[PDB]
Design a protein around this ligand. Structure first.
Ligand SMILES: [K+]
Lengths: 120, 228, 157, 31, 49, 100, 246
RNA sequence: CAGAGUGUAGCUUAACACAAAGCACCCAACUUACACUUAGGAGAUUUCAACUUAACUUGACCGCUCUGACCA
């Protein structure tokens, strides 16, 4: 019943959400974030932290992206986060590294679409 | 005038005559590229000619076959003897001939005598009023002994400078030292005559360039002399 | 709003090249050559296409504007050999000459000494290099010959 | 070095196989 | 055409904020845009630019 | 033909050593250019201090430079005494002409 | 009429003279990355952050927690580099990562995470849930000591209490099992509060459990200052949040 | 030759610690080519000590740079 920040139809990305999955992949590392529409970050998973880096051959490959989703899904359930939107670009969504990060998040129990707001 | 003499030096180069040998890694990769080029190519007219004959021969008016014709080609190849990439000057190690070390680039060195002492340097000529600094380098070739060579000069700017001082013996307020500016050129065609060869000059790769030059003179020549 | 201090914050067209609808040839200053055509002719079509692709990427690394990268018409050449103990020329082989061009503008006088020595060093075997200044003649050499215009021109004479 | 851009393959989707040969010139040289 | 609700004005859901033929003003938070680039309020509150 | 697991394993591992080998070729070429340019610019400075009249001529372009022609190396050098066979060169390049 | 800007304008640094010799963006992701940087910067003009952004105080929130551990960065970094070399030397890890069949053990990732950067994540999460604001009026602390709570549901199952996971009052009818690493001779104090459960006063909270002067890890030995009382969130009142403080 | 100056892989006033980051760069595929994108690759604190955190501060040890000695 909480209002979503509707609007922003002429720009990218949208704001009509409560929680958002944002993926940041650099030349060396991969980072996934769950943040609120107000900007605050709830939970995160990066390849910079020893916990995940000590088990990966390459922090920048597809496997790393698939493993960041398995670690993030486990952390989102603990935090209580079960729904969130994902706003990728056409080339990011078609990539095999983002296709495996979504599948890993769903297999963890996270749904990549938020339920519709109740107005009445 | 100034207390620094102006000298127009020359860096004449003989670029490679032959291709450089492939390294162990380049060999492994070149065999793969030719293997990948085959697996992704259509049958050539010479492959379709051989396949058809195989069927016609198996079933049972082409006089010459495909495999038969290949043998003719190979025979002529084995009869032709290729030029030697390694010459007699590489075995004799005659550093005065252009023909040696065809794969690598060569630099010219002439020995001059200063203060009753022999020193290896690049050809150089003192500047004269009414002349560009490069024009002084173009003149050096003419001063060379019995030389028939056409050099192609690259631009007008110098590719290097070296400054030295007389060791307190010839030092004067009028003359303190010298300042040489080098200009690169390419040896299109030509070579020296057979009159005087050994004591005059040598053609040396950048690796073996130190043996002749001095430590300080060498460091300034190894900056614009590439070995790519 | 025009009276407000934040007026003009949305201006963007002064950051974009003026594109308001063949090409006048740039002629070099005393200090910089205007335009140049780098021709790479080779009997093999892969070596010209690869050396051209190397020069195009090298010029970018060196911050040199590559105006245009194109190809020139192929020239097929029949090679006849004198038959063994005879007088008739028999077809021996067919050689194709392949040419690629890389058009650059904005080369400094001092730097050309360097850029030239780099490309000629990395020049493959069987590939020829020719760097010429651009002229309308070259540009008109890439178009089909109009013979109708040549007959009409003769009639006027 | 001559080998900087020499190692290549035909970059075409459809093309007939080509074989490597030596093109002896009028002065004895080869490529 | 033009602004119907200026800075600081109170609006109700559905109220048209601005009309325009070209995008002079863009829709922000809780502001919708129709076919004809008409900006309307999606929530009750204060208008801000 | 299908490629054996050992083959693709060898090819893939060969393209990983080839990406690092070409990274060193470009490093040497990048450094060589820097050395050349740093020596040229530094020599021009020393030339300005000595005589600014000569520095104004060196920085000028050389119209005699272009056209600049250069042939690539060979695989084997020329033979001193080699006589080629007799023949003829005949162009068969299709001429394209624009009508209309 | 014109008024001069109150500060530097956005694109003033750009030089328009050599506009043809400037590096462009050439990509939408490279412009988007710069556009996000300048959107999170302070500006003299009106911004969305001014009217909607969560107002904060300039007085940095004080820290009331334990001191951080002291670690040798040089000796730490040396050991980590060595382990990566061993992992990368094995050709079976390279082959699995190239065929896309490798995977990380989720159980080992969480044990090292709880040691290194879990406390800072739990802090970031508590700030999002508004615990420091309500409990300590803005003062923060890093939970250096991992607190493992779990409710016994039946005889074989356990409902772990993490940081915001849903738990029912039926599973939380009996006191949970509490474990935490502590040295001998130390004294602790546990606490359970309902931040939103209160029925009469908004600001106040309900005390559900209070154990004082606990020796080490043995929670039973600790004095029972307030017995355990299960959560009782009223119907139609929403979702409440109960916190265990150590 | 001493004299001073200087110190993270190419750049950086990246580095509170939770951690050696970000960009630039290299190969392949797409592209006439470039570019974009995808999928991959290589990487650094000059070295020892200093009560420890020390890439950071104090010392030398190391190379680099600059000014003369040296110099055809
Ligand atoms: K309440």
């Amino acid at each position: 019943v909480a209002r979503k920040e509707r609007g922003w139809r002429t720009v990218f990305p949208s704001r009509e959400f409560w929680h958002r999955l944002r993926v940041i992949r650099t030349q060396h590392h991969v980072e996934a974030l769950v943040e609120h529409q107000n900007g605050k970050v709830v939970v995160s998973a990066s390849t910079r932290e020893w916990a995940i880096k000590k088990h990966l051959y390459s922090t920048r490959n597809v496997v790393a992206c698939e493993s960041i989703g398995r670690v993030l899904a486990q952390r989102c359930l603990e935090a209580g986060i079960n729904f969130m939107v994902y706003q990728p670009t056409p080339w990011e969504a078609a990539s095999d590294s983002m296709k495996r990060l979504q599948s890993a998040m769903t297999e963890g129990g996270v749904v990549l679409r938020e339920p519709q707001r109740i107005y009445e | 005038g100034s207390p620094w003499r102006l000298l127009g030096a020359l860096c004449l180069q003989r670029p490679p005559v032959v291709s450089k040998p492939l390294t162990p890694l380049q060999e492994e990769m070149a065999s793969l590229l030719q293997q990948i080029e085959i697996e992704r190519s259509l049958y050539s007219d010479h492959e379709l000619r051989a396949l058809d004959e195989n069927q016609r021969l198996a079933k049972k008016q082409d006089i010459l076959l495909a495999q038969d014709l290949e043998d003719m080609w190979e025979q002529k190849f084995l009869q032709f003897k290729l030029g030697a990439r390694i010459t007699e000057a590489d075995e004799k190690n005659d550093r005065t001939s252009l023909n040696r070390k065809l794969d690598r680039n060569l630099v010219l060195l002439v020995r001059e005598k200063f203060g009753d002492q022999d020193v290896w340097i690049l050809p150089q000529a003192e500047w004269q009023p009414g002349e560009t600094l490069r024009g002084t380098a173009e003149r050096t070739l003419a001063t060379l002994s019995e030389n028939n060579m056409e050099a192609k000069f690259l631009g007008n700017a110098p590719c290097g400078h070296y400054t030295f001082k007389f060791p307190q013996a010839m030092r004067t307020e009028s003359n303190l030292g010298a300042k040489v500016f080098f200009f690169k050129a390419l040896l299109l065609t030509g070579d020296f005559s057979q009159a005087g060869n050994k004591g005059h000059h040598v053609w040396v790769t950048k690796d073996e360039l130190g043996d002749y030059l001095k430590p300080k003179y060498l460091a300034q020549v190894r900056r614009f002399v590439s070995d790519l | 709003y025009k009276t407000k201090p934040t007026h003009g914050i949305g201006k963007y067209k002064h950051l974009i090249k003026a594109e308001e609808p063949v090409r006048a040839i740039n002629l070099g200053t005393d200090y910089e050559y205007g335009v140049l055509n780098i021709h790479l002719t080779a009997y093999d079509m892969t070596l010209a296409e690869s050396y051209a692709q190397y020069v195009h990427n090298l010029c970018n690394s060196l911050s040199i504007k590559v105006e245009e990268s194109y190809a020139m018409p192929t020239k097929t050449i029949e090679v006849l050999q004198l038959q063994d103990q005879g007088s008739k020329m028999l077809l021996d082989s067919v050689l194709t000459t392949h040419e690629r061009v890389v058009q650059i503008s904005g080369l400094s006088a001092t730097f050309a000494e360097i850029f030239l020595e780099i490309i000629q060093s990395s020049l493959p075997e069987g590939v020829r290099l020719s760097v010429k200044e651009h002229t309308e003649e070259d540009f008109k050499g890439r178009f089909k010959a109009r013979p109708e215009l040549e007959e009409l021109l003769a009639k006027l004479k | 070095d001559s080998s900087r851009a020499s190692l290549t393959r035909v970059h075409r989707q459809a093309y007939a196989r080509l074989y490597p040969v030596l093109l002896v010139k009028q002065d004895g040289s080869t490529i | 055409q033009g602004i119907k609700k200026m800075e600081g004005h109170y609006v109700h859901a559905g109220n048209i904020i601005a009309t325009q033929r070209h995008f002079r003003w863009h829709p922000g938070a809780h502001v919708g845009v129709g076919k004809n680039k008409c900006l309307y309020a999606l929530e009750e509150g204060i208008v801000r630019y | 033909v299908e490629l054996t697991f050992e083959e693709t394993e060898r090819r893939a591992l060969l393209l990983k050593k080839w990406s690092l080998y070409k990274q060193q070729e470009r490093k040497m070429e990048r450094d060589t250019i820097r050395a050349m340019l740093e020596a040229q610019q530094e020599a021009l400075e020393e030339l300005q201090l000595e005589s600014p009249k000569l520095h104004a001529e060196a920085i000028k372009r050389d119209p005699n430079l272009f056209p600049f022609e250069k042939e690539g190396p060979h695989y084997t050098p020329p033979i001193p005494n080699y006589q080629p066979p007799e023949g003829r060169y005949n162009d068969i390049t299709k001429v394209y002409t624009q009508v209309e | 009429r014109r008024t001069p800007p109150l500060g530097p304008m956005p694109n003033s640094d750009i030089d328009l003279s050599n506009l043809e010799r400037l590096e462009k963006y050439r990509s939408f992701d490279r412009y988007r990355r710069r556009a996000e940087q300048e959107a999170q910067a302070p500006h003299w003009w009106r911004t969305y952050r001014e009217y909607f952004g969560e107002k904060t105080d300039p007085k940095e929130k004080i820290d009331i927690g334990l001191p951080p551990p002291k670690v040798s960065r040089t000796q730490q970094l040396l050991e980590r580099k060595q382990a990566i070399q061993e992992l990368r030397a094995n050709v079976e890890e390279e082959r699995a990562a190239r065929l896309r069949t490798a995977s990380v053990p989720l159980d080992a990732v969480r044990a090292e995470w709880e040691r290194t950067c879990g406390p800072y994540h739990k802090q970031r999460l508590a700030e999002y849930y508004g615990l420091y604001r309500d409990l300590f009026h803005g003062a923060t602390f890093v939970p250096r000591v991992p607190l493992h709570v779990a409710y016994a549901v039946g005889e074989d199952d356990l409902m772990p209490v993490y940081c915001g996971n849903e738990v029912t009052p039926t599973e939380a009818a009996q006191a949970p099992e509490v474990t935490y690493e502590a040295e001998e001779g130390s004294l602790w104090t546990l606490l359970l509060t309902s931040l939103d459960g209160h029925l009469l006063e908004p600001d106040a909270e309900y005390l559900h459990w209070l154990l004082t002067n606990i020796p080490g890890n043995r929670v039973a030995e600790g004095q029972v200052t307030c017995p355990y009382l299960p959560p009782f969130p009223a119907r139609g009142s929403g979702i409440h949040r109960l916190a265990f403080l150590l």
